[PDB]
Symmetry: C5
């Protein structure tokens, strides 16, 4: 399999072994009533860093949790600090696939199109080889 | 965790102003909510190890008014109900390691049932 | 509030003329077709700048709106003809800011409906809240 | 007539004396009869200071072709190197207004909303005085 | 006729030569048709003049994008990994028209308006001479 497929699968699995919710392999664009709670594992900004002649890449690893419609940002944090944060401390699979990992950001996005969901995004900055 | 407290501190500060408060930028608006006051964070981001895990975020306090009102009305509201409360919020002061003015923007409903002013500061803290 | 004083210092000045336009105190979102020619005065990216100081930098805008089926040349003409003169000197505006300088001259249009065509003349100013 | 007005005219005129629908400024929504359309406009015009008791400026000059419906980008290039390029070789009137000219880019843009129209945009960076 | 046309084609031709499977596009499609999927578009973006060298040299981002509807990214990787990377492995016809090619990024994009499709975008940074 391609290295990106392995990446998310390492996280995704660590998520199932653990959390009553529906997961997606990649940022979804739409959901069905039945998808919430939703947790998407995906990558963004994958880029080739090696021009010091290294094959080295870097990317933003995403674990975004979606909740149905309009909820407070604190309900998202609770879900984040109670069903995700923990799982992101022991995921040996992930370790073996990457060369470095570090906390990146923590964003809040919402469906500014059809107000169907509110989300919290936990992202790490990673480095690896294709 | 920590962002709930941060946001909360300010929400409880502005609590004590007949407006409708929102913990995190709203998406859709039911006009009963106007004047709407939202408190949220943008660009929260890890910044390294001091010993203690540092983070930096952007704290927002945006006031929304129904329809298309003249920016000034927004400033007026902002000058009368928001700044006063912002001058001193100990609860907040205790959760942060530093705070400082960032900017002041005027946004609006591009797709137009509301216009707004959004006060911001840059805060640093430990998660 | 300074932002309000600034825009005002500019609005009146500019609207003290026979200009048969409509003036807005802020970048409007929805335009009634009966609102053109339109003239809006607003600020963007106001940021605190401070070295310890109360410097605040912002971008002053004077946008001219006209029906979307109009050549830029016309907007250009509208600009040289009614705004530039007035903008050459506004003592009310001067006594509020600590510096002003030409910045840009952009061209915009309504991408959805396609109801208007505009020209945005901007300056960079500095001041203290 | 102010500088920008004169700048566009130069190119505008050149294009006329030589055969589609020309617009003085980037248009928003076209009418079936507008194709093929060519737009000559400016973007990013900014003051770069004063040189010597004179007001200096920089801007991007655009000559954009719009072809009816979604078409291969190769059709655009073809139309481009056939009607546009030649005229651009040397436009006196223009050179007599500017202070410096050089090629910037060649961008492809489409009607994201619908296959309404496809376009190839040829740009230059110029410096002039107001 | 001109360079951008030869560039895309070298890629397009190499790709169909390898796997006629999808419907290829010369440029980035504005809108698709239920049938086209799988879609594979070959295009350039940000082509900018970088100067003269005794010859005028340009720079641009070459794109090979695979569109599928809203399916998991790993499936996009999988198509990318078996219908694309092998070809891109080395394409003489292409290399023969440029000066340098380097890997840039791997972006996952998607339909935002109607969720009609989801894609994987493979990009290389290339230098050539008009």
């Amino acid at each position: 399999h391609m290295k990106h497929t392995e990446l998310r699968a390492a996280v995704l699995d660590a998520l199932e072994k653990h959390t009553g919710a529906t997961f997606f392999d990649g940022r979804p664009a739409v959901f069905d009533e039945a998808d919430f709670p939703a947790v998407a594992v995906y990558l963004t900004g994958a880029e080739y860093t090696g021009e010091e002649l290294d094959d080295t890449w870097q990317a933003e690893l995403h674990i975004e949790v979606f909740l149905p419609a309009q909820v407070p940002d604190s309900e998202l944090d609770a879900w984040m600090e109670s069903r995700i944060y923990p799982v992101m401390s022991d995921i040996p699979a992930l370790s073996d696939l990457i060369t470095s990992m570090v906390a990146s950001g923590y964003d809040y996005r919402r469906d500014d199109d059809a107000g169907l969901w509110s989300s919290a995004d936990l992202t790490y900055v990673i480095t690896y080889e294709m």
